[PDB]
Design a protein around this ligand. Structure first.
Ligand SMILES: Nc1ncnc2c1ncn2[C@@H]1O[C@H](CSCC[C@H](N)C(=O)O)[C@@H](O)[C@H]1O
Ligand SMILES: Nc1ncnc2c1ncn2[C@@H]1O[C@H](CSCC[C@H](N)C(=O)O)[C@@H](O)[C@H]1O
Ligand SMILES: COc1cc(C)c2ccc(O)c(C(=O)O)c2c1
Ligand SMILES: COc1cc(C)c2ccc(O)c(C(=O)O)c2c1
Lengths: 328, 328
């Protein structure tokens, strides 16, 4: 529903102003005693007059407060901008994090809409994965973000499905290993391995070491486009397929089919078109980032088919779903 | 206000989706019989799949509608996206027009907040004026938009001030001549001169010839940083000062002061802080485009001082104001 002006509906000043405040950690500086533009600016490394102008615009938006002496304060809503807030939103808007950086790729949406190709490269001169692969710090922030997305969307994932019955699970593209770390912590006799590029896989390793799970959890550095560790009880694809177009998606699913064999299970875990954490907005982000797409339960089925797999179940877990596929 | 989440407040997907729809003229294609993704896409030269995904996100926003068969239709609100619409909004969002292209400069807002410098260059490798001066078609669209801004904001200008008394007015930075054309049409004994760069000045000239005002309206190509046609009854600066930082603004005001001498009147016409069509949004826009800014009566006055001028009056007209300055 649009009960707000067309031009205002297309405003970029506010979205960018919020992201800049999130990047300059303005809320943190405010709650830490810096109240005036002059202060916040020096504490953040910004131009005094310019920052003041950004703040005044954000006061109008409803995130800040400004008193007679130019003393800025946080609104009830502006609290969400603090890096220590419960919702952990600020890091998603930070222009330095992978997502706060990729989202700026939307400024090239026209290219995707015309060609069907990702926009991220247009603005950054390289794919998203290539970017993370050459910037270790950038890649770490992405690992942290997906780790947070797990808490956000996979709430209760442990019990919602019968994992223990798998014995050994392979988390294909499992990042820092947050999911496996959660599955194993809730299933004493379960073991598994995280398969991912070297950055996340090494982060997964560092985690299992500290977490005390190295005895049951292992990492394997590799591309899920090549053969995967074979014969596991289950292969999980958590928020992976939507990052790829149809050709790549079957490529990935196919590999899982091979490793799964006529006795394993392939579990695609993601927000299916319909879920409350799966909107048209997210679908366009997948398009602009990697040319991926959010898919319906029917569309995943078509992909499964082309990879010799068949959906057998689809349990909704909070904001997302777990679709279970087995040998055709 | 904050009636919506922080991350939603920072959403770029929708602002860009609207701007892309505006650029692809989707609404016009729909109202003209093309109501299917394949049809609209083909008529606009977009990727069928990608366009369909853009439209679905836009029906969700409330601009379009779609039936079970995939037939798209506009809505009470999506009607404003058609070019033929009264409000004339679409052209402002078009990524091809000068303002639809300039606004994308907001993705570099951070640069402006940190340095006080304009963002436009960061994105386009050259200043706004430099860009328009090397691309006549781009400069033409800008003239049209400023022309339209006169209708949107200056409604009534003709009568709210005693123009006829000036005898001869020079519109410093008068663009394609709309304002002067409106003043002289309402006052048959008044004459004037539009002073602008090549592009607008010739557009003004063409306008005057066709509308039969060449007998009273004259064009003069030149920079308002250099001397100006002297001894005029009044020199107008319509929506010019907010395009410049304090130094340049003073330079410009000086020239007008000099040309006006002890007998002319300098008139600044623009939305000052407080006036409508004036907001923190516009202020940030001025900052990212040219490092200019929206100013208050107080602020213009300090500039007039630095230019041997002094505010004598300030009549509000519609959503803007006329600040009448005179020599000290
Ligand atoms: N070719 C490839 N081979 C293996 N992993 C890859 C890959 N390309 C990308 N990835 C990984 O795929 C993951 C997708 S995003 C994170 C998914 C994770 N299971 C979670 O839900 O948090 C990232 O860790 C990314 O590094
Ligand atoms: N150095 C310069 N000398 C003269 N005109 C200039 C200039 N730099 C920019 N301009 C003109 O300043 C104008 C500012 S925008 C349009 C202002 C016009 N009075 C209106 O209200 O529509 C543009 O026409 C721009 O081309
Ligand atoms: C689900 O996996 C992903 C992957 C990417 C790239 C994302 C990018 C931006 C986001 O906001 C989210 C999100 O979940 O909120 C996101 C999630
Ligand atoms: C007043 O002169 C200008 C100059 C520029 C560059 C503008 C850019 C975008 C706008 O929306 C507006 C407007 O008035 O609406 C605008 C006005």
């Amino acid at each position: 529903a649009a009960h707000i002006g067309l031009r205002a509906l297309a405003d970029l000043a506010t979205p960018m102003a919020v992201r800049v405040a999130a990047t300059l950690r303005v809320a943190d500086h405010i709650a830490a005693g810096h109240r005036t533009a002059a202060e916040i600016a020096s504490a953040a490394g910004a131009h005094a007059d310019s920052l003041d102008r950004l703040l005044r615009h954000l006061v109008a938006v409803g995130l800040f407060t400004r008193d007679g002496q130019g003393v800025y304060g946080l609104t009830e809503f502006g609290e969400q901008l603090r890096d220590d807030h419960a919702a952990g939103k600020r890091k998603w808007l930070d222009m330095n994090s992978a997502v706060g950086r990729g989202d700026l790729g939307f400024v090239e949406l026209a290219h995707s809409i015309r060609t069907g190709q990702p926009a991220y490269p247009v603005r950054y001169g390289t794919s998203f994965w290539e970017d993370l692969g050459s910037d270790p710090v950038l890649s770490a922030s992405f690992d942290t973000l997906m780790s947070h997305h797990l808490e956000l969307d996979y709430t209760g994932i442990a019990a919602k499905y019968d994992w223990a019955a798998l014995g050994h699970v392979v988390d294909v593209g499992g990042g820092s290993g947050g999911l496996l770390s959660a599955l194993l912590t809730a299933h004493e006799d379960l073991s598994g391995t995280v398969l991912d590029l070297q950055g996340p896989a090494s982060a997964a390793h560092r985690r299992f070491l500290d977490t005390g799970l190295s005895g049951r959890a292992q990492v394997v550095v590799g591309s899920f486009f090549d053969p995967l560790p074979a014969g596991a009880g289950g292969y999980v694809l958590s928020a992976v397929l939507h990052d790829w177009d149809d050709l790549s998606a079957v490529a990935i699913l196919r590999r899982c089919a091979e490793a799964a064999g006529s006795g394993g299970v392939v579990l695609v875990i993601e927000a299916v078109a319909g879920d409350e954490h799966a909107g048209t907005g997210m679908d366009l982000r997948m398009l602009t980032y990697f040319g991926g797409k959010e898919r319906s339960l029917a569309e995943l089925g078509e992909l499964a088919a082309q990879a010799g797999l068949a959906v057998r179940a689809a349990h909704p877990i909070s904001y997302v779903s777990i679709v279970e596929m087995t040998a055709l």
